[PDB]
Swiss-Prot record, chain B:
Modified residues (N6-succinyllysine): K49
Family membership: Belongs to the eukaryotic ribosomal protein eL32 family.
Biological role stated in the UniProt entry: Component of the large ribosomal subunit. The ribosome is a large ribonucleoprotein complex responsible for the synthesis of proteins in the cell.
Signal peptide positions (record): none
GO cellular component: cytosolic large ribosomal subunit
Disulphide bonds in the chain: none
Alphabetized UniProt keyword annotations: Cytoplasm, Isopeptide bond, Phosphoprotein, Ribonucleoprotein, Ribosomal protein, Ubl conjugation
Localization: Cytoplasm
Taxonomic superkingdom: Eukaryota
Name of the protein described by the UniProt record: Large ribosomal subunit protein eL32
SUPFAM superfamilies on file: Ribosomal protein L32e
Curated annotation (Swiss-Prot), chain C:
Region Disordered: start-end pairs: 5-38
Organism from which the protein derives: Oryctolagus cuniculus
Organism lineage string: Eukaryota, Metazoa, Chordata, Craniata, Vertebrata
Coiled-coil positions: none
Gene that this polypeptide is encoded by: RPL21
Annotated protein name in UniProt: Large ribosomal subunit protein eL21
First and last residues shown, out of full length: 108 to 160 of 160
Compartments where found: Cytoplasm, Cytosol; Cytoplasm; Endoplasmic reticulum
UniProtKB/Swiss-Prot annotation, chain D:
Protein name per the record: Large ribosomal subunit protein eL6
Residues with the N6-succinyllysine modification: K43, K152
Subunit description: Component of the large ribosomal subunit. May bind IPO9 with low affinity.
Gene Ontology MF terms in the entry: RNA binding; structural constituent of ribosome
Modified residues (N6-acetyllysine): K167
GO biological process, one term: cytoplasmic translation
PANTHER family recorded: 60S RIBOSOMAL PROTEIN L6, LARGE RIBOSOMAL SUBUNIT PROTEIN EL6
Source organism per UniProt: Oryctolagus cuniculus
Major subcellular site: cytoplasm
Functional summary from the UniProt entry: Component of the large ribosomal subunit. The ribosome is a large ribonucleoprotein complex responsible for the synthesis of proteins in the cell.
Curated annotation (Swiss-Prot), chain G:
Source superkingdom: Eukaryota
Record cross-link Glycyl lysine isopeptide (Lys-Gly) (interchain with G-Cter in SUMO2), residues: K57, K64
Cellular component annotations (GO), alphabetically ordered: cytoplasm; ribonucleoprotein complex; ribosome
Record organism: Oryctolagus cuniculus (Rabbit)
Any one Gene Ontology BP term: translation
UniProt gene name: RPL28
Keywords, alphabetical: Acetylation, Cytoplasm, Isopeptide bond, Phosphoprotein, Ribonucleoprotein, Ribosomal protein, Ubl conjugation
Protein name in UniProt: Large ribosomal subunit protein eL28
Keyword presence, Chloroplast: no
Length: 109, 128, 53, 216, 51, 225, 125
RNA sequence: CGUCGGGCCCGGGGGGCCACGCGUCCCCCGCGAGCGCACGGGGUCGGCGGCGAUGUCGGCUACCCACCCGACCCGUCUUGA
RNA sequence: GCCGGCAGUCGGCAGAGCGAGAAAGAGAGUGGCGCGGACGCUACGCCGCGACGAGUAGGAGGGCCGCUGCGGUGAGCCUUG
C-alpha cells in the first residue's frame, strides 16, 4: 500500500555541447551519488508517468487519462549518480527537471 | 479477416518525412518538389549542421522491403477485367489497383471478379 | 659481385648446398655475452654549470 | 543388446573432458573391443481388391511458396532450456513480489518448477496469497530463511496445475492444497518470533530509504 | 560466414587448433592441484600456529 | 552396373575422411612441438640471464626481429615522403596494424615516420589476439577472415604454413618464409584505444604515445583489441 | 527458331505490359504470365497452357502439336479436364512427365490448374 | 664446476600420451555399423499475460500547438558574402 | 572489383554431387508393390563475396522522372462522367 519505485529525475538528453542525441536519456535517482553504487540500478525498468486529455485504456483496470513511455537503464554516466536510460520512444523534452519512476522488478540481487 | 500476403516482413524505412526544397516555406512560387541547390554559398549544398537534409543514395530502402503497402502487397494498376487475370499467379504477394478513369458500371464487375480469383483490391468500394 | 656469385654458383653445384646468394640488410646484433674483467663499470656524472664565456 | 552406461569422464569444464582421448581409449577399453566386417495397403472391396494409398497427394496447391529456412543448431525450444536459480533464493526464504497484484507483499518461497517459475506461497491467513507462481526477475529475495526441509510438498501440483484454463471460481482442490500446505508451513513460522507479523506487513519505500543503500 | 572469436568460442578455437583442447585441459588440473597444495600448506601453518 | 558404382562413392568418401584425419593429426602435433618451441625460447633467455649474473658479466639480449606498427595519426595533412611509407606498410587508416620485421631498411623507414605511428615489439600472447580475433586474409584480393585452416594452406601451404600455429610460428619466430606471411594477412582493423591515449602528437619519451613503444606496446594492444 | 525470335518479342510485343515496376505478358498459353524466355506460349515448339473451361466447370488444357508449325488453326489441340479436383491435377501431371513434354512447366501448370478450381466454386459465405 | 639446458629429456641396470591389430625380410641398440547431447557453416520457443461495438485500438507521413538542441537570405562577382 | 557463379530444371529414357590444402576421370572395355521430386533463367536476367562511398568549375552514365506531337501497340479508358 506504499511506493514500489525509486525517485528519479530526467536531467536531459545524451549530449555534448553543440550536439544533442535524443535517443538516450540522463537520469538522476536521488539517493545515489557515486560510481561504485550505481550497479544496483543497471537494467532496471524506468517509466515516465504523465497524463493527457483524451481517455486511454489501462491493463487491469478502468480506462484513465494517464500514459507512459517505457524504458530501461543501460549503463552509468560520469561517476556522479548520473545514469543513462533508453526508452522505447524518445522523451518529449518537456519532462526535463520532472520526476519519473524507475522500478525494481527487473531485479537480480 | 482479409487477403493476407504470403510473407509479412517488418517494413522499415530509414526516413519517413518528405524531402523539402530549400526556402519553399518562405515563398509560394517554390514548390515542395526537390531541387538540388547548385549555388556557390548555400547552406544546404555544403551540408551545414542544423539545416535541411539532401536526398542521397543512403536513404534508399532495402530491396526486400521496397514497394509494399503496409498491408504487404505490391500495387498494380488495373483498367478492365481482361487485365485482372494476369495476377492469378501473384495474388499472394501482389494486389490489384483500380484506375481513376474506370466507370462505376464496370468497376463493380472487376471487384467481384477479383473475389473469385482471390485478388486483393486496395479500393474495393470507391464509386459504389 | 656477379663474378663472385658465379664462382660460388659453379662451386657447391656438385655439393648442392643452398648458400645465401642474395645480399641482406643489417640484421639484429646476434645476442652475445659481454664481460668486464673484475672492475665495476665506473659511474659517470653530469658536469656542474659554469659560464665559460 | 546392452545396458547403457553413463559418461566415464566427469565434467571438468563445460565442453571439456577431464581425461584425454588416449586415456579414454584405456578407459573405454577399445583395445579389446575392436570389430570388423508402406504407403500402399491392400484392402478387399465387395470388383476385387483395392490398393489404397496413405498420405495421398494434395488436392490443392497455392500459387507461390516459401523455401525452407537454414538449419540452426543451438536454438532449443523453451521446454528444453536449462533453468537456473540465484544463490540468494533458497527454499524457505522470504520473498518480495512486486509486479503482481499482490504488490510489495512478503510472500514465502517453496520450490522451483520445471518451467522455472517459483512455487511461492505466503500463508492465506496472513498474506491472502494462494499457491501461486512468480518469475525470478520480478522478485526481491530477502535474506530471511526458515527450516523448510522437513515438509511434504504435494507432487500433483505442477506447471499444468497453475496454468490458466480460459468468472474464475476457486476449485475445491485449490482449497485442499492450501490447507495441506498451511498445516505444514504455518506452525514453523510461528516458532520464530515476529515473522508472522513481518509477513502481514507490506514492503514500501519511504523518504530517506534508497534500495542500493540498505540491505535485504 | 559469421566470424566467431576463437578466444571466447571454445569449439571455434578447436576447429582451428586441436591442441587448444589439452592446453585448456592443462592449466586446469595444474591450477586445481596448486590450489589444493596451497590450502593444505596454510593448514600446515595452522598446525604450526596451534603447536 | 550400380553395384560397383556404389563402392565408387563410398570409398572416395572414406579416402577423404582418412586424409582429413591424417592432416588433423599433423595440425595437433606441430602445435605440440610449437608449444615446446615457445617454452624453448622463453626459458632459454632466462637461462642466459642468470648465468651472466652468476659471474661478473652481463647478457645483452638481441633486439627482437619483429615489431608491430600502428598508425595513430589521420590522413589529413601528411608529407608525401611520410605518405609514401604509410602506404608501403599497408597503413592507410588510423589505428591500422601490421607486422614488420627488423633490418636496416626497416628502422630507417620507421625513423622518418614516428610522429604518425606507434610501434614496438609485441609479446607472444599479443600475436594471438591479433591473428585470431583480427586475423583477415588477402585471398584473391579479398579480405577473407581466417575461419578454417584450409584458407591458409592454399596460399602458403606449399610454403609449410597450413594452420594458425604454422602461421603464428612463422610470424613470431621470423623465419625464412616470412614475406608472404605478412602479405597474406590483411592490415589489422584495430578498434579505438579503450581508456584513452596519453598524447597523440608527441613522442613516447616526453609522455606522448607516438614513436617506439619497445616494451609497453603489449599494454596498448589489449586496448586496441 | 526459339532463341532467335525471343530477342525480338522480349521488348516490343503487343502483350508486353510494364506498368509501374513489374513486367507481365498477356498472350494465350502463358502460365504464370511472366515475360520470360521459359514462360512464353508462342516462341516454343512445345507449349503447355491451362485455361478455364467455356462452361465454367473444368479446365481445358492446350497442347502444341510439334508436327506442323505455321498452321495455327491445327497447331494447337484442346482437351477438357473435369474431374474430382484431385485426379484433375493428376491428369495434367501425367500429360507432362509421362510424355516427356517440355518438363520445366510441370509443376507451374499444376499451380495454375489448382487456382482455377477455386474460381469455379462458391467463394464467400 | 654450473643448467627444473638440447638431442621424440642419448642409453643401460605417482602422472600424462590424439600410441593398440597379426605374419615375413633388412638395419640399429583403404567401404564395421546404430542412435543421442551439443561454446559446431548469422533466432528460436514443441512459452505466455491483458483490454476491447458505443469508446477504444493503430495511423511512421499528413493539419495545428508545446519543449530541447542546432540553425544569419537566396543567386552572382570573388582568395574572401 | 572478382579470368565471379547459374544453359545442370541433364527425373522409371532418373540417380539429384565437384567449399574441396596439393597438375589431371564419381571414363569405356579385355585375360587371369506405390508414377513421385518446393523457387528459377525479363541470361540487357538471377544469385554470391571483398573493398569503397565528400565535393566547386567540369565530364560521363542511368532515369519504369516529366511536357508536346507522330508511326505502331493495349478487342485501352470514357456522359453510370
Amino acid at each position: 500500500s506504499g511506493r514500489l519505485w525509486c525517485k528519479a529525475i530526467f536531467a536531459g538528453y545524451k549530449r555534448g555541447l553543440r550536439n544533442q542525441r535524443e535517443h538516450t536519456a540522463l537520469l538522476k535517482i536521488e539517493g545515489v551519488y557515486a560510481r561504485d553504487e550505481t550497479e544496483f540500478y543497471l537494467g532496471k525498468r524506468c517509466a515516465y508517468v504523465y497524463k493527457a486529455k483524451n481517455n486511454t485504456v489501462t491493463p487491469g483496470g478502468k480506462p484513465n487519462k494517464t500514459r507512459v513511455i517505457w524504458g530501461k537503464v543501460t549503463r552509468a554516466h560520469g561517476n556522479s549518480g548520473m545514469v543513462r536510460a533508453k526508452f522505447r520512444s524518445n522523451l518529449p523534452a518537456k519532462a526535463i527537471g520532472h520526476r519519473i519512476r524507475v522500478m525494481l522488478y527487473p531485479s537480480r540481487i | 479477416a482479409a487477403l493476407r500476403p504470403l510473407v509479412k516482413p517488418k517494413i522499415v524505412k530509414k526516413r519517413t518525412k518528405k524531402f523539402i526544397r530549400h526556402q519553399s516555406d518562405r515563398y509560394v512560387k517554390i514548390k515542395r518538389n526537390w531541387r538540388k541547390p547548385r549555388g556557390i554559398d548555400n547552406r544546404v549544398r555544403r551540408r551545414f549542421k542544423g539545416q535541411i537534409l539532401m536526398p542521397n543514395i543512403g536513404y534508399g530502402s532495402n530491396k526486400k522491403t521496397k514497394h509494399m503497402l503496409p498491408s504487404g502487397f505490391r500495387k498494380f494498376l488495373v483498367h478492365n477485367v481482361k487485365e485482372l487475370e494476369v495476377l492469378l499467379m501473384c495474388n499472394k504477394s501482389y494486389c490489384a489497383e483500380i484506375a481513376h478513369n474506370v466507370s462505376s458500371k464496370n468497376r463493380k464487375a472487376i471487384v467481384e471478379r477479383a473475389a473469385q480469383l482471390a485478388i486483393r483490391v486496395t479500393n474495393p468500394n470507391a464509386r459504389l | 659481385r656477379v663474378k663472385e656469385n658465379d664462382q660460388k654458383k659453379k662451386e657447391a653445384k656438385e655439393k648442392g648446398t643452398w648458400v645465401q646468394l642474395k645480399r641482406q640488410p643489417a640484421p639484429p646484433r646476434e645476442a652475445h655475452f659481454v664481460r668486464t674483467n673484475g672492475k665495476e663499470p665506473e659511474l659517470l656524472e653530469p658536469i656542474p654549470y659554469e659560464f665559460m664565456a | 543388446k546392452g545396458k547403457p552406461h553413463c559418461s566415464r569422464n566427469p565434467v571438468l569444464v563445460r565442453g571439456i573432458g577431464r581425461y584425454s582421448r588416449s586415456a579414454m581409449y584405456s578407459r573405454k577399453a577399445l583395445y579389446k573391443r575392436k570389430y570388423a566386417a508402406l504407403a500402399t495397403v491392400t484392402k478387399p472391396v465387395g470388383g476385387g481388391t483395392r490398393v489404397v494409398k496413405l498420405r495421398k497427394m494434395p488436392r490443392y496447391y497455392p500459387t507461390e511458396d516459401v523455401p525452407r529456412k537454414l538449419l540452426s543448431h543451438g536454438k532449443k525450444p523453451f521446454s528444453q532450456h536449462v533453468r537456473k536459480l540465484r544463490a540468494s533464493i533458497t527454499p524457505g526464504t522470504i520473498l518480495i513480489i512486486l509486479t503482481g497484484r499482490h504488490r510489495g507483499k512478503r510472500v514465502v518461497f517453496l520450490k522451483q518448477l520445471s518451467s522455472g517459475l517459483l512455487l511461492v506461497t505466503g500463508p492465506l491467513s496472513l498474506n491472502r496469497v494462494p499457491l501461486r507462481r512468480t518469475h525470478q526477475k520480478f522478485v526481491i529475495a530477502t535474506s530471511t530463511k526458515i527450516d523448510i526441509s522437513g515438509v511434504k510438498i504435494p507432487k500433483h501440483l505442477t506447471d499444468a496445475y497453475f496454468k490458466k484454463k480460459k468468472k474464475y471460481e476457486i476449485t475445491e482442490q485449490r482449497k485442499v492444497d492450501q490447507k495441506a500446505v498451511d498445516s505444514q508451513i504455518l506452525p514453523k513460522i510461528k516458532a520464530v518470533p515476529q515473522l508472522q507479523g513481518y509477513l502481514r506487513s507490506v514492503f514500501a519505500l519511504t523518504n530517506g530509504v534508497y534500495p542500493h543503500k540498505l540491505v535485504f | 560466414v559469421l566470424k566467431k572469436n576463437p578466444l571466447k568460442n571454445l569449439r571455434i578455437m578447436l576447429k582451428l587448433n586441436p591442441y587448444a583442447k589439452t592446453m585448456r585441459r592443462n592449466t586446469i588440473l595444474r591450477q586445481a592441484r596448486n590450489h589444493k597444495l596451497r590450502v593444505e600448506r596454510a593448514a600446515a601453518a595452522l598446525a604450526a600456529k596451534s603447536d | 552396373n550400380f553395384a560397383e558404382l556404389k563402392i565408387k562413392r563410398l570409398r572416395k568418401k572414406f579416402a577423404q575422411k582418412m586424409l582429413r584425419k591424417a592432416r588433423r593429426k599433423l595440425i595437433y602435433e606441430k602445435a605440440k612441438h610449437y608449444h615446446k618451441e615457445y617454452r624453448q625460447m622463453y626459458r632459454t633467455e632466462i637461462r642466459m640471464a642468470r648465468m651472466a649474473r652468476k659471474a661478473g658479466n652481463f647478457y645483452v639480449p638481441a633486439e627482437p626481429k619483429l615489431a608491430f606498427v600502428i598508425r595513430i595519426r589521420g590522413i589529413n595533412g601528411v608529407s608525401p615522403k611520410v605518405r609514401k611509407v604509410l602506404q608501403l606498410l599497408r597503413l592507410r587508416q588510423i589505428f591500422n596494424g601490421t607486422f614488420v620485421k627488423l633490418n636496416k631498411a626497416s628502422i630507417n623507414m620507421l625513423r622518418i615516420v614516428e610522429p604518425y605511428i606507434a610501434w614496438g615489439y609485441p609479446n607472444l600472447k599479443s600475436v594471438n589476439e591479433l591473428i585470431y580475433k583480427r586475423g583477415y586474409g588477402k585471398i584473391n584480393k579479398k579480405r577473407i577472415a581466417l575461419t578454417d585452416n584450409a584458407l591458409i594452406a592454399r596460399s602458403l601451404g606449399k610454403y609449410g604454413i597450413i594452420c594458425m600455429e604454422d602461421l603464428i610460428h612463422e610470424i613470431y619466430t621470423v623465419g625464412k618464409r616470412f614475406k608472404e606471411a605478412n602479405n597474406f594477412l590483411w592490415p589489422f582493423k584495430l578498434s579505438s584505444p579503450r581508456g584513452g591515449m596519453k598524447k597523440k602528437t608527441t613522442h613516447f619519451v616526453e609522455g606522448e604515445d607516438a614513436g617506439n613503444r619497445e616494451d609497453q606496446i603489449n599494454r596498448l594492444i589489449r586496448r586496441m583489441n | 527458331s526459339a532463341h532467335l525470335q525471343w530477342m525480338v518479342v522480349r521488348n516490343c510485343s503487343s502483350f508486353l505490359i510494364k506498368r509501374n515496376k513489374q513486367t507481365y505478358s498477356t498472350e494465350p498459353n502463358n502460365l504464370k504470365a511472366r515475360n520470360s524466355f521459359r514462360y512464353n506460349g508462342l516462341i516454343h515448339r512445345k507449349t503447355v497452357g491451362v485455361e478455364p473451361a467455356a462452361d465454367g466447370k473444368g479446365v481445358v488444357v492446350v497442347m502444341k502439336r510439334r508436327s506442323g508449325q505455321r498452321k495455327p488453326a491445327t497447331s494447337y489441340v484442346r482437351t477438357t479436364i473435369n474431374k474430382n479436383a484431385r485426379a484433375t491435377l493428376s491428369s495434367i501431371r501425367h500429360m507432362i512427365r509421362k510424355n516427356k513434354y517440355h518438363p520445366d512447366l510441370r509443376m507451374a501448370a499444376i499451380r495454375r490448374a489448382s487456382a482455377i478450381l477455386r474460381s469455379q466454386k462458391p467463394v464467400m459465405v
